A paper describes a structure:
The m4C methyltransferase METTL15 maintains mitochondrial homeostasis by catalyzing m4C839 located in 12 S rRNA helix 44 (h44). Similar to other members of rRNA methyltransferases, METTL15 has a two-domain structure: an MTase domain (domain 1) and a scaffold-like domain (domain 2). The domain 2 of METTL15 contained five α-helices and one η-helix, which formed a scaffold for the binding of RNA substrates or other functional proteins. Here, we reported a series of crystal structures of human METTL15–hsRBFA–h44–SAM analog, METTL15–hsRBFA–SAM, METTL15–SAM and apo METTL15.
To further investigate the mechanism of m4C839 modification, we determined the structures of apo METTL15 and the binary complex METTL15–SAM. Comparison of these two structures revealed that the root-mean-square deviation (r.m.s.d.) of the Cα atom was only 0.145 Å (269 to 269 atoms). Therefore, we mainly used the METTL15–SAM complex for subsequent description. Comparison of the electrostatic potential surface of these two structures showed that the positive charge at the SAM-binding pocket of METTL15 was significantly enriched after SAM binding. The crystal structure was solved by molecular replacement using the structure of apo METTL1570–407 solved previously as the search model.
Author numbering: 8 to 291, 303 to 314, 329 to 338
């Protein structure tokens, strides 16, 4: 949290929005530096939200826990009486929490086997499609588009073809099952003895899992909406600090901080919204002062609102 909080520079008497409370690390680090604050602690994950509620028992004056997605943040802040132009700082750490990555039943990680779930909202929305629903239902071209667009997976076609053939034999319901199917798309001479293809990053199924995660959790639209809410509720002179972990979300943060307008779904025709993957984050007056960019496999960007 150190560098994140460092760029925030919490001062006595200030008010903060942590939009990605997660395991609580940054919010706790902020409280260690300055206890005389108010902090709204938001997460879309019930598990993280329950940790924020617990924290609010030890810090009842400061902490206000909220359960909600980035796209729900504005309504939650309005219902809590929070006015635009209020926050001295807003924090968006886009990384998966340790609870998400280290609970195999959630199905985020390539380490231990578990259900191909991958919903950040956990059990909050039982009708929300899982990664399993997606890979068992979509057709080959649609799967390939998701993997190419969201995972930047050069081998989208072959991998999507392998999923479609595999799911005809048995439904794909587990993470290691999907990882094995992905690996089976590559001839042995492509991958033999290649230890990097098993390592934490650079694992052969990494981009596939990342693409499904972004799709299942609508991460690109959510992020853009969250950024606009952060800007609206920051006061003049307040700081936005964002931590990005892959290139699509970092490009969205970057473009946002440059005041470059990007795709609102309301501007897309119904046909495009149904049949095309999002182009957010893809290649094809001043509102901010950009005060930090640093690589920590994550990229921190910090800005002061003018």
């Amino acid at each position: 949290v150190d560098e994140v909080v460092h760029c925030l520079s919490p001062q006595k008497g200030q008010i903060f929005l942590d939009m990605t409370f997660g395991s609580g690390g940054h919010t706790k680090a902020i409280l260690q530096k300055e206890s005389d604050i108010v902090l709204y602690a938001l997460d879309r994950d019930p598990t993280a939200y329950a940790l924020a509620e617990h924290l609010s028992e030890l810090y009842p004056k400061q902490i206000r826990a909220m359960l909600g997605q980035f796209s729900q943040a504005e309504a939650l802040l309005m219902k809590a009486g929070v006015q635009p132009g209020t926050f001295d700082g807003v924090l968006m750490d886009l990384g998966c929490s340790s609870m998400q990555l280290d609970t195999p039943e959630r199905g985020f990680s390539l380490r231990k086997d578990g259900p191909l779930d991958m919903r950040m909202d956990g059990g909050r929305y039982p009708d929300m499609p899982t990664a399993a629903d997606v890979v068992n239902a979509l057709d080959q071209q649609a799967l390939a588009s998701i993997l190419r667009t969201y995972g930047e997976e050069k081998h989208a076609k072959k991998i999507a073809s392998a999923i479609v053939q595999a799911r005809s034999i048995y439904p794909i319901t587990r993470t290691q099952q999907l990882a094995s199917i992905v690996a089976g798309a590559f001839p042995p001479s492509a991958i033999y003895t290649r230890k990097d293809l098993l390592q934490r990053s650079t694992h052969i199924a990494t981009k596939t899992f990342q693409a499904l995660r972004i799709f299942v959790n609508n991460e690109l639209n959510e992020l853009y909406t969250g950024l606009k809410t952060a800007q609206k509720f920051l006061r003049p002179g307040g700081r936005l600090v964002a931590l990005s972990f892959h290139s699509l979300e970092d490009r969205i943060v970057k473009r946002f901080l440059l005041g470059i307008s990007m795709t609102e779904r309301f501007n897309l025709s119904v046909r495009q919204q149904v049949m095309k993957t999002s182009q957010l984050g893809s290649d094809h007056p001043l509102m901010w002062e950009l005060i930090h960019k640093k690589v920590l496999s994550a990229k921190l960007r910090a800005a002061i609102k003018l």
